[model samples]
Structure formats: structure tokens, C-alpha cells
Target: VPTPNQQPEVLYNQIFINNEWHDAVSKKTFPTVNPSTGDVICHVAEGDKADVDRAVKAARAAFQLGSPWRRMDASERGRLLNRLADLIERDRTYLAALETLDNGKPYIISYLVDLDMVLKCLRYYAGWADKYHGKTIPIDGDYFSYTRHEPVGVCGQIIPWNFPLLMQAWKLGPALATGNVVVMKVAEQTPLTALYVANLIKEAGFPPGVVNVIPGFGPTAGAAIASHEDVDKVAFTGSTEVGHLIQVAAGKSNLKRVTLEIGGKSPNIIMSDADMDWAVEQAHFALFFNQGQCCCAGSRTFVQEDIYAEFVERSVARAKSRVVGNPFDSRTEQGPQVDETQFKKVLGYIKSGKEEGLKLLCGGGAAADRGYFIQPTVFGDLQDGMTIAKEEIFGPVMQILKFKSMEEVVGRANNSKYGLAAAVFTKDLDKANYLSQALQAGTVWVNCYDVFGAQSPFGGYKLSGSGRELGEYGLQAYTEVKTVTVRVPQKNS
Candidate 1:
């Protein structure tokens, strides 16, 4: 009953709907386990259709023109987001720690990378709060036409747990900037930080139902949102399989606008001319950063045949050297998988790698520990047809393939079902440009890898899912365009 600040711990178990905490309509809760130790941290509200309906009803009301949220000016919306950003900055330490606690990622990874991105993303979208404008068209004859880029109304945002905090910012930034209301369901694996931030959203002066944070299972809560007739938009970040389900759900319901940033099998190519040291570093970072849980992780690696032996050796050494232990340890470079399911999945892929006749260069299985940790794994002689190479393992399992020529590498790179992102580590600008342009991915990294910013948009092509997130283009995802044409006299009266 007390305010969030009065709580003893940052952990929250209740659902945040319409700017207040409440139990699910079913009055049920589920234990959120810590991947690092398999310990039950806290019980989170298990929201179902009843709870989702309550949240959606509130959002629909808030979307009404008579509501305070709808009556507020766009510039004022920017100021609120700025305030929220300030709050995040002020509580970065707590939120980052909570993220690490909820999701089994390194502490610094959250404190330095994820939380910082959240701040940057929120602030970046804040700048666009007043800048989102429609085109004033010049039509032929007596017709005067103009377009309005208006909010898409109630948005259902289903975020994956891998990058929980940042994913919330990704979904919220644009939805809020365009003056739309939101119903966000944080993946049950990592909802602590989001529920913590719900307090900040309330204190940031957002009206009731402008943003609601729900921690619930995907089947019940997520399916309800996607199929909810009142929801004007649905944004999801997760597996490609689920993206399809959400797509179908939207069409079967209100046919709401859907945007998805889904699974990826991104390829990182190490050209012959690349600096070995830099290339190895990037190659390791490409597949292992965030424990290879990133949607755009460069899991399928391509290397010039000339450096295949050298690259595989050095990559194995690097993979072996990576630290695997408690995420809280400052020296820990690799953290546990998000949970047992992911742990088993990673190990299964490792087993498949060995059985597929690919040389197991290093780390054949899970680490012998009490946690859901897998050794930094590396596999050699990777073929495009191999299960490990073709499927998105979504773990710290690296598969390195050899290519004879630039043409061959390009051909192999474009062979994947996913075209989210790719990287080419070649100092030769010409080669970099040639390969970068040749790769079918949405975003390409030349020389360096994983270079991201608030200004650069990110998403995918082909099966990596539709719609871009981040930057100004991200703001466009939450908006709908309406064109108005008026017939007028040819001459000014």
C-alpha cells in the first residue's frame, strides 16, 4: 500500500497498471528465478486476460481527447520524457543492479552498456517529441492537402528478457514521444527493473494508463495484447516464430499496426586483409557480447580461407580465455544464460555441433557449476547446412566457416534466413564497402563491429522481421499518417 520509495527493496511483485500497483485479477503470482543461482528472487504478478483487459481499458480511456494525456501538448510530452530520463540517470546504479539480478548478465554490461543506452534512447526520443511533424503537401488544382503524423493510440509492447531495461526504453521512447499510451509486458525472466521503473514513470507525472508495466507469461498476457481489438499498435522483440504469431494475432483482431524486431543469424566476416588482433577481438565480441543472447549476434562467422587456421586458433584461445562465473564479479566476462531452458538449449546446440562432425575447437558443453553457465564455446569447420550454423542458437556458441573468395563469402553470407546485421573487418575501404554493400543485412559494420548509437537505426531484412527501431525512424513506428485534402477556390478571395 505504501509508495514504491517506501519499499524495503527495489524488487517489486505487483503489477503496474494505470499508474498504480495491483494484484492480477486472478490473484496469482509466479516465482522469478535467478539464472546465476537458480534461486527464487521474488514472485511477480501473473497477469492474464482479465488483467490485460483492465490495462487496455485504461489506455483506451487515456487515448480519448478528453483525457489529460491526450490534452497535453507534444512539447510537454518531451519534457516528461526528459524528466523520466533524468530519473533513470539518477537511479542508474539501482536499476543496473536490478537488471543484472533479474537477467543473468554481467553487472558492468548493464551499468555501462544497457542502462546507458536506455538513457540515450529516452533522451533521443525526447528531442523528437516536438519535432514529429507531417508533410504539408502541394496538390494540383483547388485541392490543398496536408498530412498528420499522429499517435497510433494504445500500443501493446511485448519485450524480450535479454535486454529487458533497454527493450522497455526501445518500446517506450517512440510510443511516448508520439503521445500514444502503452501496455508493456516485460518478459517474466526479467521484470524487476521494469517494475522498479514503474515508480519513476508515476513520479515523472505521466497520467494514469499512459504507460503500464506488466510482468506475466507470454501466452496469456502477450497473446491478449496482440489480439486485443482496442490496441492500435503492437511492437515485439523476440523470436521469429513468435513474431509470426503476433502478426497473425494482430490480423485476426483489429489488424493493428505491427512492428517486430525478431530472431537473427547475423554473419561476421573476417577478410584476409583484416588485422588479426582487431578481427579476433571483434569476432569474439560479435558472438559473445551479452553471452551471445543478442538478436543481432554475429553467431555465424565467415573467415577468408587463407586465415581460417589462424582465425580458428586465435578465436579458440580467446573463447577459452573469457571468464565464466558470477555476473556480479567485476572480473567476470561471461555470465550465465537467462535460465535453465536457455542453458539446456545452448548445451543442446553444443552437442549438435560435435555430432555434426564440425571440429569442436573448444567448450563442448556447459560449465560444471551450480548455475546456468556455459563455457565460451567455439566450433570449427562450420558448414552452412550444419544445425549450429543454420539455426540461431541464442547462446555463447560460435561457429566459424571458411570462404575461398570474396564472391564465395558474399554468397554464403546471404544464404541465411536472417538478414538482421552483418560485419566485415577489413581495413581496405574498397573491400569493406564492397562486402558491406553486398551483404543483405539491414545494418553492416566495416572494420569495427557492434558500433551503435541513438542516431543509427537498427532492425532487419527478410526473416529478421519488419520495422526499424531506434533513431527518428523508431519514432515513426508508433505513428499513423492521415492525409487531409480540402477543395478551395483557385484565386484568393
Candidate 2:
């Protein structure tokens, strides 16, 4: 492991518009702090409505007919995406360190898992640039019919702070692959790494105005991008509340296309037959991964009554074992929440859990005097109406509930307004299949959790938000389908 005090250099701190860096029109800046220490890392250019308008204009210009970005061949677009991926790979170490400092995820996960997934996501879509095919259809008439899949003009992408660079890759990969230009509004809390990656996007030789990055507040910059008339589409990954606002803004504006990946309180069901040891560990990881900030984190653990007692005991021990400290430490398993606001929000949730009479199995408060660190909390005897069970804490807190049967658990699990993802752990294949099919979630894991592969589709079923990300399905959101019919010559029949 490297020394604990190592710090990645802060290179770029300006708005990236039209492939060039510039100060915000308001000349405003906001401080992005290190969550691990509560120290202000640096002030980034704070973009608002004026800056978003500039970016939208640039993106619109780049996406116009005969423009360089539009005129480029699909295969060359693939090459450009691959080149960007290569640049990111070259700077992977520095990028990971930057992510740890800005976002407070452990360094190993930042380096190994998140960075690796970003590369795979970009490369996966790079290969899809020229390969996404349009369809030819046959009609019972004297005509030739076909459908063309074309890019949605300028895409306004807004990403959250939890997984900054990874979300950038998710939004950028398919948008660029399908020949769309972008004006992205990054989350204010962790904008450093995204701004730095914008420099790499320029170095990767993308044309001017093809991609733009605005680092600013949600109400100002994010709302501007969502409501911009020149933008043809908007993609967002954040809270369900904000998702509703973006959808409303889209409709209230030009009815621009919108795709959202939002919050979840996913259920992890462990059957009586499941290996107790495995269930305990996987359940811990399911919620604790990325400091339990995953939108699809299995925040609700439903264990069969037979093993609930032993499972709770082991789970509490595992939570106690989790090392919460400086994210840079190699041995650290958990880190601080992303920011102070999130820290307080999570703590508030924990307080509600206690007030509702849920048995506190372990941690329930801050872990340190400074920084936004929180203990890996576990609560037992979760009832039907508990706030912690019903809402998304988005922190390192686990709520374990008891279930009597598979059918009861299924109904209880599906009892959520958010249906993002779920997991099942059982030795019986029949039980796994039943739960996987019965669960009302977009993605279901058979025996594991948080196994997101680039080739697979992921999203939510109901209010968890609409549309999918990753895989070829993700490409669908960035494109529009147009049906073309040509009159055919009459044939002797």
C-alpha cells in the first residue's frame, strides 16, 4: 500500500465547454471538500444557467447536419471512444486516487473495481458504435419499408456524486456510440475527477462541442440542462425526487426524451436452506459496498425464521469487523459518506430506526470526531412500517428482517415504491427461479449481489426510475427510430 498522506494533483478546475476550458459566466466557484477529513480540496468553476446555455449551443452546433461530429463515420466514432478509454487507462491510478479523495470510497475499490468497470463500460460501447443495426420490415403493400436508428440530437446528462467517473462513462459511452453530442451537468460535491476527465476527453481528440461538462448546483445548472429547448434528450441518475423534477422539466419544456436511474430499497432474501456463513458475508457486502451508497444496495435483508438468530449474530460481528478510517488505507473496508449533508441524512435515518423500536444490533452513529464517517449499523426485528426498512438510507446501515416463508417474503419484498434491484440466496434452484421471476425489480441476482456486468441490462421496474443503463439496451435511450417507406414498382402477380 502507498503512504496514507499521498494526494493526487488537482489539474483542471474550470468548466469544459466546446472542448475548451473556460470560467463560468458568473465567475463563481464552489469548494469540493474531501469527505475523509472535511478539508476543502479545491474550488471548482460553478456553472449556472448562462454556462448551461453556452454548452447547449455548442452541443447543438456540433450535432447539426454536416458538422464534424455528425459527418464522421460511425467506425471512426468507435475509434475515438476507444482512444478515450485508452487515455483513461493510462491515468487510471491518478484517477482512482482523485476519486478516493473526492468521493470517500476506499482506495482499493476505487482503483480495482470502479476504474476497471469504467474502462469496460467505455470499451463495451466503443465496440457498439458501428454495430447497432437498423431493421428492414416487410409490409403487405407495394412498398419497401425499413427503420433507421438515429442519434437524438444533443443529450443533457446529469450525474450524481456517488460514482462520478463511473456515471460519466455510463452516460457518455452510449451517447457517443450512437453519434450524439452531450452537455453534462456533474454533481457539485464530487466534480473534481469528472472535470479532470474532461481534459482527457479533449486529449482523446474528440471534436469541439461534441462533449461539455458543467460542474454546478442542481437547481441552477442541472435544471437548465433539463429544461433547455435546444437539447433533444436528458439522462439522469439521482434521487427519485429529483428524477421527478427532471421528467417534469422535460415535459414542461420541449418534451425532450428522458431516462432516469434512481433510488432503491432492494431486498436480499436468504432462505432457510442458504448457507448461513455465506449469507451473512454477502448480506454485509451487499449493503456495505461503496459505503452502502449503491442505488441498488440490498438495504433490506430478509432472512428465513429458522436461521434469523444466528444470521443476526454473525452479521453484527461482521459489521463490527469493518475498518472505517481514511479511504487511502489499504486495510480500510468502509469509508466516510460522500458529504456532510449525506452524513446527517443517514444519521437522521438511523435515529428514526431507533425511535420506531427496531432492535439496534450494532453501530448507529458517527465513527469519528471529524470527517463524514459513520459506523456500519445493523438493526434487527425490522417491522413492516419502520422508516429504515421503507426508505433508502444510502449509507453503511443494514436492516435485517425475519421471514416465515418464501411466499410471505416475496410479497413483503415487493412491497416498495422503488423496484431497482433484488437478490436471492438459496441452495434450491427452484426457489431461486421462483423468487427471481416473482420479484418486481429490474435486475435480480440468484446467489450473489451487486454483480453488474457491462454486457447485461440494469434499471428499475417501477418508481426506481425508468430505462436501463449498460449493454445494448442502454444504446436505445440515446437513439430515435424512424420508419422509412419507399414506393415500389408494380410486379406481375
Candidate 3:
């Protein structure tokens, strides 16, 4: 990582608008720091309402009737998406390095998994381009009835910091496939790579203004997108509190279509019948992966009373084995938080967990002094009302709670205000089925965790935010269904 007064070749630093790059309307810029080293990477443009307006106007023009983007064949749209995916693969190395530089993920992790996910999602949406069809229904008399899935014009997408590129593609895939123009603002903490993606989209020969990237603080750019009356739809992936703001903004404006994939306090229950060895390995990865920055981290672990002690013992050892340090290091398994603020926030959460009477089993401090790195902390003997158990820390802290019975655990798991995802580990089929049916989460892993794909729909219930992000259902978020019926006179027939 570059220290003060030194940096690599500056790639993309300006606001991307209408297939071109320009300074923000205010000519203001914000410094993006390297999380691993706590040093300035570069200054990205700080786009506000003026920039959003410019981008939105361009998007509206792109989506206008008889425009190149709107009038082009759906199959042709698929071809553009496929070409973009190919460019991603071709430039995978540079993109991966940039992602690691922007966010504190290991280079290999960002490349093989995150970027790979982006590629797969784009290709999946490519296949759906022509397949995004309306259904036909038989009508009485000499009449024809059908439904049209028309694009909701000008989507304003606000994505979070964690898994930045993947989330970008995941949201963009369905929107582009459905033929909607987009103005997306990536999280300010990690905006470099998505800006680079804008160049790729332009390279793929997408019409001017089809997609735009504006990187700025959430309050300014994000809120503008959320409340913009001209934008027909908004998609957000972030905290539940922010999700509430976006929803309120959408309603407060034109009542635009909004889909939010937000926060979670998901439960991971390990029944006594579960394979202890296997469960420990998966649990460690599930909780500590991305430094516990996952929105759906299985952080709330419930082990059956029969195997509680052993589970904690083995889990502690596994936690200690995690390697946390510089993201570019080949051996590093976990990296620093996305920024210094997040680092302190996570540490505060750990302190709160300690003060709330939960026993700290291991790793209750910082792993490094230079960067924003936290230890892979674990807490034991946690109860229902404990701060860590009740809150979504979005950190690498694990809570191990013991459960006496199925009914008891199910109630405890569903007690949260958030229900984005959960996991259940058991050898017994009947027990697995019961827990699967009982959990209120959107996704319940039978014996695994964080297993998501392009083919599956992902969203949550209650406060975890509404609507889906992947699969065919994701396309629906960018589209509005219109029913058409035509009746012919008997004489004409």
C-alpha cells in the first residue's frame, strides 16, 4: 500500500456521467484511504445532488421511447452484457488488485470469489435478456389478453462497502437485462473499483447514459438518489437504519419502486447430532470471513447443551488459528476493517459485549496497531438480552450461546428485529427440516453458510429489508407489469 505523498498510477477518480467522466459539480473530492495501512489511496470526486441530477437526466434520455437503449432488441442487450463479462475476465488481475487496494480483502479472495461472482451474475443475466417475457392468457370472445414486463425507468442503486464489486454486478445484472438505465453510487469507503467498472461498461459499447457511477458520501449522493422524483426505482444494500431512510425518501418523493437488501443478526444453530469437527470449520469461516463484515454473518451461534462445552473449546482454537494482517499478504486469511471508523466501532461493540457480562473466551483486542485490524474475538455464555446477541455489530465477534431444546432455540433465533439469513447444523433430517421451517430468516443453510448463487433469490423478512436481489425475482424489481387486453367486434372477426 502507498504511504503519504506516494501512490500508484491514478486510474479512475472522477464522476462517471453519460459514458463520460467529469469533475463533480462542486469540484470537490474526498480522500479514499487504504484500510490495511491507514493511508490515502486517492481522492475521488464528491458528487452531490447536482451530479445526481446530471446523471439522472442522462439516464432518462437513455431510457426515452425510441432511444437506442430502449429501442434496441433484448437479445442485443444480452450481447452487450456478455461482452462486459468477458472484459471483466480479461481484466480480472487489475480489477482484483484494485479491489484489494480499495477494500481490505485479500487479493485472492477478491479475485477468485468476489470478481468471479460478478462474472457469473452478469452471464446469468445475459441469458435472461431475451427470456424476460410476459405471459399470455386466454380471453373470452374475440379478444387477446397478455401482460408486459416493462422496465422501470432510471434506477438509482446505492450499494454498501462490503463485497463492493459483487453487489454492484448483482444489482446491475437484473436492471440492465430488464433494459433500465441506472445511476449507482458506491460506498465512499470503497469506490475505486466500481468507478473502474464504469469504464468497462463504456468499453462494452453501452449507449451513453445507460449506466452512471457517482461516488460520494451517503448523506449527499445516496439520499439524493433515494429522494429523486425523476428516478423511477431505487435499489439499496446496506444497514437497516439506512434502508429505512431510503424507503422513506422513496415514499417522500414519487413513491418510486424500491428494493432494499439490508442488515441481519442471523442465528447459526448446531445440534448435538451435528458433526462437531465439520461444524467448527464452517463456523469459523462463516463468522470471520471478510473480517465479519458480511451482512449475513452467522455470528449468533447456538450449540446444543449436550455439546456446548466441546463446541466452545474447539471453536476457540479455530478462532485463534485465523491469520489477520495486511490484505495483500498471501497467507492472510482476515484483513482490517474497511476504515478506521468501522475499526473503532467494532472494537466498541466488543467492549459492549464484555460489559454486558458475556465471558470473553478468546481474542478480545486489536490484532495490529498500525491498521484498523481487530482480533477474531469470541464470547461465551451469552444470553438473550446481551448487547452482542441483540445487535448487528457487523464485525468479527462471535457469540456462542447454549440451547436446551429445539423450540427454545427457534424462539431465540427468531427474536431478532433482523432476519436476513441463518444456518442450521444437524445430522438428523427431521431436525433440520423443523429448524428450516421455523426460522424466520430469508435464507437458512442446512449445514453450510454464506452459500449464494445467481440462480437463487435472496432477500429477507421483517426488518431485514424487502424484495429480492438475484435470480428471476431480481429482474422484477426493475420492472413494472402491465396487463393489456384487446377486444375485437364480432363483425371484424
Candidate 4:
């Protein structure tokens, strides 16, 4: 790992607008600190309404008539994306280190899983660039008709802080591969990684103005990007409340196409027939992975009453076994929370749970003194109506609710306003199939907790957000369909 004082040459200290690194018009800056040590690692350019306008104008220009991006051949676009994937793969270690420093995730996790996922996502979209083709509709007689899929011009994308680099790739790879210019905003808490990616974009030989990255507060820069008239579509991944605001802004401004992947309060149900040992193990990982900063984390756990007592005992034991300390340490199982704000948020939720009369099984409150760390917490005998069970805490706190039947558990699990993902722990084939179909979430797993890929469609059903990302559906989100008909005359002169 690089030493704290060793400043790896600043790859990007300015906003990337019109494909070039430029100073922010607002002349304001914010320090992105390393959460582990509370040290200012680097300063990022802060953008507001003015920077948003400049980025929107550049993207609009790139998408307008006679634009180089619009005229580039489909195969060439695929080649560019492939080249980008190669460059990212080459610098995977460096990018992973940056992500760990900025986001406070373990370096091993970022390098081994997150960076690999980013590369796979880019390659997946790269393969589809040349395969995006129109359809030919069959008609009677001499009439000819077909549909063409074209780019939707410029897009405005906003990413979340949990998975900064990965989320950016989720929106950018498919958007650019589909021939759309982008004006993207990074989450205020974790903006450094995306700016570093802007440097890579330059190294990969992308044309000027094709991609733009702006880092700033949500109210100024984020709101501007959502409301900009030049943006043909808006793609966002964040909290449900902020997503609603973006929806309103998009509707009020230009009715831009919107795709959102918002919040979740998913449940992991363990039926009486499940393998107790396996269910307990998977449930522990489901809630504790990434320190429980996942959108679809199995925060709400429903164990059958027959096994509730034993399951809670084992789960608590597992929580106690988790190693929490510096994320850079190879032996650490759980790392610090992203920052102090999130650390306090999780603690506040734990306090509320206790005040509201829920039984805390084990492990609550902060861990260690130097960093923003929280011990893996587990709450048992939680009532369904308790805030801990209903709301999304987005922390490493698991709420256990007892259930009598599969039917009853399914009903209770579907009661949430957010329906992003859910899981079932059952060995029986019939029970697994039944629960998978019964759950209202977009993605349901039988034995696993968190398993996602570029080929599978992922999104929510209700307040969790609209539309899907990844797979063919993800590529289709950035394109518009146009149907054309050609007339033919018979030889009856």
C-alpha cells in the first residue's frame, strides 16, 4: 500500500468537462478525506449550476448534428469500449487502491471483487455495441416495414457512494456503448475514484466532449444535471428520497427518460425445512458483507419459529467472530463505515431500536477509537412495525422476526414499500420455487444472498426505483426506437 504522505501524482484535480480537465467555474473545492484516518487525501473540484450548464452544453454539442460521436461506426464504438476495458484491467490495482482510500472499503475486497466486476461489466457492454440492431417487421403484400434503434442523445447519470467505481461503470459503459454522450455526477462523499476514471478515459483515446465528469454537492450540481434540458435521459442510483426529487426535476424540466435503482429493505426468510447450518452461515454473510452498505442487503431476516431460538444464538456467535479494524489489514473481516456521518447514522438507528423496545441480541455501538468502525449488530424478537425492521438502516445491523408459516412470512416480507431484492433459505425444490415466485422483489435468490452479474436484469418493483440496469435491458435503456415504412409500386403501367 502507498504511504499516507506519498501523494501519487494527482491524476485529476479538476472537473472533466468536454472531455478535458478544466477548472470549476464556481472556484470552490472540497476535500475528499480518507475515512480510515480522517486525513484529507486530496481536493476535488466542486461544481454547481454553472459547471452543470457547461457540461450539458458540451454533451449536447457532441450529440447534435454533424457530431463525431453520432457519425462513428458501431464497430468502432465497440473497439473503443474494449480498449477502455483493457486500460482499466491494466490499472486495476491502482484503481482498487484509490477506491479503498476514498470509500473506506477493504483493499482486498475492492481489488479482488469490485475491480473485476467493473472490467466484466465493460466487456459485457462492449460485446453488445456491435450487436444492437433494428428489427424487421413482417407485413402483407408489397409493404415493407422495420424498426431502428438509435441513441437518445445526451444523458445525465448520478452514482452512489457505496460502490463508486462500479456504479459509474454500470451507468457509463452501456450508455457510451450505445452512442450516448454523458454528463455524470459523482456522490459527494466519494468523488475521487470517478475523477480518476476521467484520466483513464483520456488515456483510452476517447474524443473530446464525449464524456464529462462533475463532482460536487447534490443540491447544486446534482439538481442541475437532473433538470438540464439538453439531457435526453436521466439515470440515478441513490436514496429513495433523493431519487424522487430527481424524478420531479426530470419531469418538470424536459420529461427526460428516467431509470432509477433506489433503496431496499429486503428480507432473507429461513423456513423450517431449510438446512440450519447453511442458512445461518449465508444469512450472516448476507447482512455483514461490505459492512452492510448494500442496497439489497438482507437487513430483515425472518426465521421460522421452530428454528428462531437456535438461529439467533448461532447468528450472534457469528457476529462476535467478525474481525473489525483497519480495512488495509489482511485479517480484517469487517472494515469501518464510509465516514463519521454514516457511523453516527447507524448508531442512531441502534439507539432508536433500543428505545422503541426491541431486544438487542448482541454487538451494537462503534468499534475501535481511531476509525469510523461499527461492530456487527443483531437484534432479535423484533416486531414487524419497529423502525428497525421496516426502514433501511444501511448498516451492519440485522433484525430477526419470527414466522409460523411460509405463507405468513411471504406476506410479511412483501409488506415493505421498497422491493429491490429478497432471499429464501430452503433445500426443498418445490418450496424454493414457490417462494421465489411469491416474493415481490425484482431479484429473488433461493440459496444465495448477493449474486449479481452483467447478464442478469436488476431493479426494483415499487418505491425501490423504476427500470433495470445490466444485461440487454441496460443497453436498451439508452436507446430509442423508430419505425419506418417504405412504399412499393406494382408494374401495372
Q: What are the root-mean-square deviations of the candidates from the true structure over C-alphas?
A: 3.1, 1.3, 2.5, 2.2
Superposed Cα RMSD, model 4: 2.2
Q: Each candidate: how many clashes? A: 0, 0, 0, 1
List model 2 lDDT by residue over 1-493, tens digit each: 3333358899998999988999999899999999999999999999999999999998888988999888899999999999999999988888999999999999898889989999999999999999999998877688888999999899999999989999999999999999999999999999998998898999999999999999999999999999988889999999999999999999999899999999999999999999888888899999999999999999999999899999999999999999999888888899899999999999999999999998998979999989999999999999878999998999998999999988799999999999999999999989999999999999999889999998999999988989999899999999899999988895223
lDDT of each: 0.88, 0.93, 0.90, 0.87
Candidate 3: list runs displaced more than 4 Å. Answer: 1-8, 490-493
Q: What is the RMSD, in Å, between candidate 3 and the native fold over all Cα?
A: 2.5
Top of the candidates by TM-score: 2
Which pairs in model 3 have colliding backbones? none
TM-score quality measure for candidate 4: 0.96
Cα displacement (Å) at residue 17, model 4: 1.4
lDDT of 1 by residue, 26-111 (tens): 89999888788888888988998888899999888889987898889889999999999999999887777778877888888888
Using all chains and alpha carbons, the TM-scores for the candidates as numbered come to 0.97, 0.98, 0.97, 0.96
Candidate 4 lDDT by residue in tens digits, 302-401: 9999999999999999998888877777777787888889999999999989988988887699887877889889999999899988888988898988
Find the 10 residues in a row with the least total lDDT in model 4.
1-10
The candidate with the higher lDDT, 1 or 2, is 2
Error of 2 at 106 (Å): 0.8
